Amino acid sequence: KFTRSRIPEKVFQASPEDHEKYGGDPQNPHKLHIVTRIKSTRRRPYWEKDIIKMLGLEKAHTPQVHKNIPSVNAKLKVVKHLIRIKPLKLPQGLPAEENMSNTCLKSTGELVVQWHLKPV
Amino acid sequence: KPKLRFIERAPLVPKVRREPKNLSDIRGPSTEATEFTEGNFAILALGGGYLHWGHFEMMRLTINRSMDPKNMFAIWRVPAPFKPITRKSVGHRMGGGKGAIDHYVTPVKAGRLVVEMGGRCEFEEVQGFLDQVAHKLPFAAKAVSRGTLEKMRKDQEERERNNQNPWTFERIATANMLGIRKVLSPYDLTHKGKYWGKFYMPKRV
Amino acid sequence: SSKNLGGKSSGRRQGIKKMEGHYVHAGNIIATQRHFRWHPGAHVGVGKNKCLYALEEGIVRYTKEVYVPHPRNTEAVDLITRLPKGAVLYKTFVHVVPAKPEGTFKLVAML
Amino acid sequence: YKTKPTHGIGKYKHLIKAEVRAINLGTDYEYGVLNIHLTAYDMTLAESYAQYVHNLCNSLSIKVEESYAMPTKTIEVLQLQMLLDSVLTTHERVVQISGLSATFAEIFLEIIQSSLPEGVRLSVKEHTEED
Amino acid sequence: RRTPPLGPMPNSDIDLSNLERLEKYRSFDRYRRRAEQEAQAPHWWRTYREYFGRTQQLLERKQAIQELRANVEERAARTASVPLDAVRAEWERTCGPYHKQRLAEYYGLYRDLFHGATFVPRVPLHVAYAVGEDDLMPVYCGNEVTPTEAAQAPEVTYEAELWTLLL
RNA sequence: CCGAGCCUGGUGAUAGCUGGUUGUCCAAGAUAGAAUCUUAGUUCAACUUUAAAUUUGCCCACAGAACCAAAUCCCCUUGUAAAUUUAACUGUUAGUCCAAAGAGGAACAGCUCUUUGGACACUAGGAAAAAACCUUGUAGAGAGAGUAAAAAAUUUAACACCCAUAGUAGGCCUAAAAGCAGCCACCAAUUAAGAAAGCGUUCAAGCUCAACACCAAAAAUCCCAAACAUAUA
RNA sequence: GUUAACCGUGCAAAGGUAGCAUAAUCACUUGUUCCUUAAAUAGGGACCUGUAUGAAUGGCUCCACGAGGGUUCAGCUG
RNA sequence: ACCUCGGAGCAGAACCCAACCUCCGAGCAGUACAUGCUAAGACUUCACCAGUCAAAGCGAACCUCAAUUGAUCCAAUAACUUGACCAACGGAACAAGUUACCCUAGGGAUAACAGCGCAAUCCUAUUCUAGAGUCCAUAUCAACAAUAGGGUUUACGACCUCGAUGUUGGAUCAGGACAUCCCGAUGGUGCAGCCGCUAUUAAAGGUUCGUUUGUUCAACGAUUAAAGUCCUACGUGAUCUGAGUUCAGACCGGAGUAAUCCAGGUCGGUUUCUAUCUACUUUAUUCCUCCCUGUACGAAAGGACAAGAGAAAUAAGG
RNA sequence: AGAGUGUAGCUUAAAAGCACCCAACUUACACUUAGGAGAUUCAAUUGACGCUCUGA
RNA sequence: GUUAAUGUAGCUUAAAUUAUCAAAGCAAGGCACUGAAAAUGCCUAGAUGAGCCUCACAGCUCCAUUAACACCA
Ligand SMILES: [Mg+2]
Ligand SMILES: [Mg+2]
Ligand SMILES: [Mg+2]
Ligand SMILES: [Mg+2]
Ligand SMILES: [Mg+2]
Ligand SMILES: [Mg+2]
Ligand SMILES: [Mg+2]
Ligand SMILES: [Mg+2]
Ligand SMILES: [Mg+2]
Ligand SMILES: [Mg+2]
Ligand SMILES: [Mg+2]
Ligand SMILES: [Mg+2]
Ligand SMILES: [Mg+2]
Ligand SMILES: [Mg+2]
Ligand SMILES: [Mg+2]
Ligand SMILES: [Mg+2]
Ligand SMILES: [Mg+2]
Ligand SMILES: [Mg+2]
Ligand SMILES: [Mg+2]
Ligand SMILES: [Mg+2]
Ligand SMILES: [Mg+2]
Ligand SMILES: [Mg+2]
Ligand SMILES: [Mg+2]
Ligand SMILES: [Mg+2]
Ligand SMILES: [Mg+2]
Ligand SMILES: [Mg+2]
Ligand SMILES: [Mg+2]
Ligand SMILES: [Mg+2]
Ligand SMILES: [Mg+2]
Ligand SMILES: [Mg+2]
Ligand SMILES: [Mg+2]
């Protein structure tokens, strides 16, 4: 029977060479994920069909921000293949009320809070 | 006694309930006898398969007619055939349940030793008629020694450490990295990526 | 030929009807079984078909506990008198922790 | 969830039981089933010694199976010297044994000889019979 | 799937190969005793209990029992009486305190009077209410006496030596 | 046109069966079963629709479910917004393949039978054409742009050169068995040659070797794209 | 049981009689043998296990006869 | 063969889960007679109907089993109650044969012919040396087995066709494969020669006439260089034959009371089309006689190659 | 002579729980009912008696 | 291939369990001897392996054997 896959938790562990591979570090984890769907939910079972709808990834290549809590991480751990996770790193902090109007995404996952259309 | 005894077809206590062909008995590695005991050299089985009574007569003839009973001796590792095979009469449609019991087989998995031999010789003495009998078994089989079996296991282990390819079967299938468990089997979490169906793929790490 | 027949019995639909943690009101059925699986613990009765009906309203629990049979149960005392010296049986049991207290005292008259 | 990590909290199969000669290389016999024979012209003294033998086996933790009794013979006095007539019958009790320690044997036998009663024939041997 | 066991399993230190040489309970009241022992172990799995929870005196005793064992000729073995007033007069001195603490704890006196923090009453208090003129109905540690008998103050004795009393 | 004439009438006989069922547009929409002279059908359930009222539905974590593997159930947090109930209904209930656990059969079938999950009956690209595989879904215009899936790799067997005398036709057993019919033993001459490893003899006898020495493819109309090893992923 | 005339043994209402025969007559069958042919699963004449022949469900021969169905000598003719 | 009910496996750990799937069982018995009355709450054989369990109370002491069954209407009796192996077991209150004299509605949902899938069965090639072959595994044959390939048999499947895909042999014309019968070239031989056996390569060309049978087949007579294996809708019926098989008649034996029925046999039995489209419609082999000669070979018997010359015969074109 | 030391047969018992015995049933054993026998080697953490071990 | 039927003294039949009667065979008793007639006796794993009970017995597992069925294109 093809059943629901349950992943052992020794896969979700980072060896120290991975901290050289990707820039993240266990001290100071990122607080927010950016999830983008990169696979269709068709030819995939109904639980994955509704977990994508729960996470709000209906349109592929559309970014959503999400909490780095273990409950949401567990929902991601059944659709870890259909998605693409990048940690939302912030050079400047969260936007203020006068700074909400001019922001953008800037893939490589850097939510800049001052977006001008002018070169450097 | 230094000779393989007569193994009897159709066991003297017969079977009266017709068992289904429980097809786990060919798949994967063996939990049964994979090791040597009171011997030196043997037959390794590189793939699953049933054994009729014909192969039993073939082995009992092809080792005894080419072995000198003053120097070498031989023991089975497999039992007499116990699993019944049900065969209908020929020319019948589908329907009506299973037919009568026809014959009896014994199942051997991969890696289970079949015929073990020892005595006051060396592996090159036995290997001749051993590759004679080994090609006629109904799967891929091989002649092995206690030394060469260990050296082969060292090669199969060293290939697990030598590969530069970062994606093994065990990194992917245990994690279900592509959702590939939809395509794979549940037995590919434990057999490994080596076994496929009946055959055993030895070159695949 | 089909010398076999008769095996057209349906499924019994017996099992746990109320898993651990559920709030169970009085008289509800907890489990149904043949060939005993769970034994009754506190405030759990047993029907003639070995049903485990709940007696008092509360939350159901499941505990392993040591099994001391009835002495006139001649079926298992022969097991008891053949157990070795370090042996304790540990059957499993279903309980209910009762939720509502049996009654409070209410001021009705001033006399 | 469960089979699960309280699996086998209760299993009355491996604990309880189910359902020759002790070969025992080197420590040669470590004996199998011996039948020890208490025969007497009394019934009661042989029965008393059978009870005592049984309690001695249960005291020294040797295992026994059966304390059965062969059919009691009837012999008159042999009418051999006037010819003389009096019926004195021989009763028989037989206590089985199953196990033994080999080095222990002589102590158990010595206590049987030392405690052996009056007019009672002791005989150990092996088995083939029926009541 | 098979999760590993956390604590040491029961019946794990007895299952040998030689099970014909084990002790093997022949009774039922051996097994019931060894089973009702097991209601007290902490038991890592799950319990019912979790959800529902000098030398001179010795020599005098060994002399006095030696006297009483030989004096009765054992004639009244195959119908004694054991005089209860004497038994109570000795029990109130010796193990009355050890038993009235149990009555206090089953009534939950310490979780009401002292918020816990038990104590052993070393002084017995003979208190008796005046029923008419005679008799006096004594109050023990857990008795039942109605508010009719307790209309007037009772008689208190204790056989001790500066005190204060509270009802 | 006779297994029972023809014509009128009952008669628009009836038909669980076949065929047909005529404007535009848009939205929701898929098959657990149980009975049944029933399996070409219908009724109820499931699914679906619509309108409503009302509140939780999914996803889930420690704990938890039995003695004789994948997994499941229960399940707060958590991400989400559907669910239950009432009212009114029809239609499907003659289904395929793929993967997985199986069963029957030949461990045959584009075979039959259940279960978990897909897709298919629904558009689009790809695997040549293609229902079912892989990519992908909510729609229009564009003579914009980045992507997804997406192109089979293999070519394989050389080999030693030389030297050879003897106790001895080793004992036994055999018409005869002499290294070689079968048994027992397997020492010993020189440097080095086995009481012989294949021959070859009726037995012998001759050749050698061992030792010194020397340094994979076959079927029936006509093969089947064309081709192409080297300017920078 | 001695291919048996013969013997034993049941059952039955009676145990297929005369005939006739590999037939228009289950199968074994292109049965065996003689004639016909250079060569005959065809035709004629005999042999009977016909093991499912048979007596007015008529049986067996035979004279004439047949747009019957198979066999044939001789001629003869694309 | 089965039709209903229950337990176990498939269905390994909530539940469910098919089968003309594997194994067992049931159509009861026994003991009390409070096997009394009422009443919260639940479960439930995937609907319903049915079933199940049951605290409190009233009244009294002080049921085992797994299944062990049957609804409504009805028949009784004054009532309570009781009635089917209605076992086609959710039950029509009581109804069997045969149709080839058949008819109608349909179905490729469903069979025969054919196609297709498979390769159990079949055929061939290998691998392996057991054994034959006087010795000798391999000139030749081959057991126990193993791996691939073929799609000619007998099957099985039921995917196209039932608002028709006409069938067995034969005639006519053949096309292709090569797994070659001969003719050609080689290798080996337990090959002296003549003969043969076998392996590789070769598909240019050809592969007879009859008696019997519907016959493909098979048997047999006479031949020849040889009288090949197949496939092509078991090639080809808008080219033909209908003798079989395959309608209505009829007999004989058998089954059946009868109607009737028979891979059991036998006589008889309408075989349609005026061509719309595609396609199409003129391009040498072999045998034998002679000679070589009775030479090579063998001891003879017997007996050739290659070289030469001559005659035919069929095919093609005139 | 030195050393380990010291509760009735056993005790991570502190006057105990087990062990043990004799009747009654049981062929016996057992189960059970009845009954039974019992100990901190000797004086204020130390001392001298009891075994055991290490000795000549 | 499927159902159905049968298993006997030595041969056949029987008997609702238990097991007969009739030939065959074994002795005998009569005329010179057989035969015949009789009389004694003998001969049954009731074709299979268990016993649920107790089994020709009543259900298997059987192992032999016997008929019907092997179908109107
Ligand atoms: Mg079932
Ligand atoms: Mg079912
Ligand atoms: Mg109509
Ligand atoms: Mg219908
Ligand atoms: Mg829509
Ligand atoms: Mg019906
Ligand atoms: Mg299919
Ligand atoms: Mg030589
Ligand atoms: Mg005939
Ligand atoms: Mg003719
Ligand atoms: Mg339900
Ligand atoms: Mg009550
Ligand atoms: Mg029904
Ligand atoms: Mg007719
Ligand atoms: Mg007619
Ligand atoms: Mg019609
Ligand atoms: Mg079809
Ligand atoms: Mg169809
Ligand atoms: Mg077909
Ligand atoms: Mg040979
Ligand atoms: Mg189908
Ligand atoms: Mg048709
Ligand atoms: Mg048409
Ligand atoms: Mg060729
Ligand atoms: Mg002709
Ligand atoms: Mg002709
Ligand atoms: Mg045709
Ligand atoms: Mg025509
Ligand atoms: Mg045509
Ligand atoms: Mg005519
Ligand atoms: Mg056209």
Swiss-Prot record, chain A:
GO terms for molecular function: structural constituent of ribosome. One of its GO terms (cellular component) is mitochondrial inner membrane. It is found in: Mitochondrion. GO terms for biological process: mitochondrial translation. Keywords: Mitochondrion, Ribonucleoprotein, Ribosomal protein, Transit peptide. Its main location: mitochondrion. Belongs to the universal ribosomal protein uL30 family. Component of the mitochondrial large ribosomal subunit (mt-LSU). Mature mammalian 55S mitochondrial ribosomes consist of a small (28S) and a large (39S) subunit. The 28S small subunit contains a 12S ribosomal RNA (12S mt-rRNA) and 30 different proteins. The 39S large subunit contains a 16S rRNA (16S mt-rRNA), a copy of mitochondrial valine transfer RNA (mt-tRNA(Val)), which plays an integral structural role, and 52 different proteins. This is Large ribosomal subunit protein uL30m. It comes from Homo sapiens (Human). The gene is MRPL30. The chain holds residues 35 to 154 of 161 of the full protein.
From Swiss-Prot, chain C:
One of its GO terms (molecular function) is structural constituent of ribosome. The keyword Mitochondrion applies. The keyword Transit peptide applies. Its main location: mitochondrion. It is found in: Mitochondrion. GO terms for cellular component: mitochondrial inner membrane; mitochondrial large ribosomal subunit; mitochondrion. One of its GO terms (biological process) is mitochondrial translation. Keywords: Mitochondrion, Ribonucleoprotein, Ribosomal protein, Transit peptide. It comes from the Eukaryota. Belongs to the bacterial ribosomal protein bL27 family. Component of the mitochondrial large ribosomal subunit (mt-LSU). Mature mammalian 55S mitochondrial ribosomes consist of a small (28S) and a large (39S) subunit. The 28S small subunit contains a 12S ribosomal RNA (12S mt-rRNA) and 30 different proteins. The 39S large subunit contains a 16S rRNA (16S mt-rRNA), a copy of mitochondrial valine transfer RNA (mt-tRNA(Val)), which plays an integral structural role, and 52 different proteins. This is Large ribosomal subunit protein bL27m. It comes from Homo sapiens (Human).
UniProtKB/Swiss-Prot annotation, chain D:
GO terms for cellular component: mitochondrial inner membrane; mitochondrial large ribosomal subunit; mitochondrial ribosome; mitochondrion. GO terms for biological process: mitochondrial translation. It comes from the Eukaryota. The keyword Magnesium does not apply. It is found in: Mitochondrion. Keywords: Mitochondrion, Ribonucleoprotein, Ribosomal protein, Transit peptide. The keyword Ribosomal protein applies. Belongs to the mitochondrion-specific ribosomal protein mL48 family. Component of the mitochondrial large ribosomal subunit (mt-LSU). Mature mammalian 55S mitochondrial ribosomes consist of a small (28S) and a large (39S) subunit. The 28S small subunit contains a 12S ribosomal RNA (12S mt-rRNA) and 30 different proteins. The 39S large subunit contains a 16S rRNA (16S mt-rRNA), a copy of mitochondrial valine transfer RNA (mt-tRNA(Val)), which plays an integral structural role, and 52 different proteins. mL48 is located at the central protuberance. Interacts with OXA1L. This is Large ribosomal subunit protein mL48. It comes from Homo sapiens. The chain holds residues 48 to 193 of 212 of the full protein.
Curated annotation (Swiss-Prot), chain E:
Component of the mitochondrial large ribosomal subunit (mt-LSU). Mature mammalian 55S mitochondrial ribosomes consist of a small (28S) and a large (39S) subunit. The 28S small subunit contains a 12S ribosomal RNA (12S mt-rRNA) and 30 different proteins. The 39S large subunit contains a 16S rRNA (16S mt-rRNA), a copy of mitochondrial valine transfer RNA (mt-tRNA(Val)), which plays an integral structural role, and 52 different proteins. mL38 is located at the central protuberance. GO terms for cellular component: cytosol; mitochondrial inner membrane; mitochondrial large ribosomal subunit; mitochondrion. Belongs to the phosphatidylethanolamine-binding protein family. Mitochondrion-specific ribosomal protein mL38 subfamily. Keywords: Coiled coil, Mitochondrion, Ribonucleoprotein, Ribosomal protein, Transit peptide. The keyword Ribonucleoprotein applies. It is found in: Mitochondrion. Residues 54-79 form a coiled coil. GO terms for biological process: mitochondrial translation. The keyword Ribonucleoprotein applies. Its main location: mitochondrion. The lineage of its organism: Eukaryota, Metazoa, Chordata, Craniata, Vertebrata. This is Large ribosomal subunit protein mL38. It comes from Homo sapiens (Human).
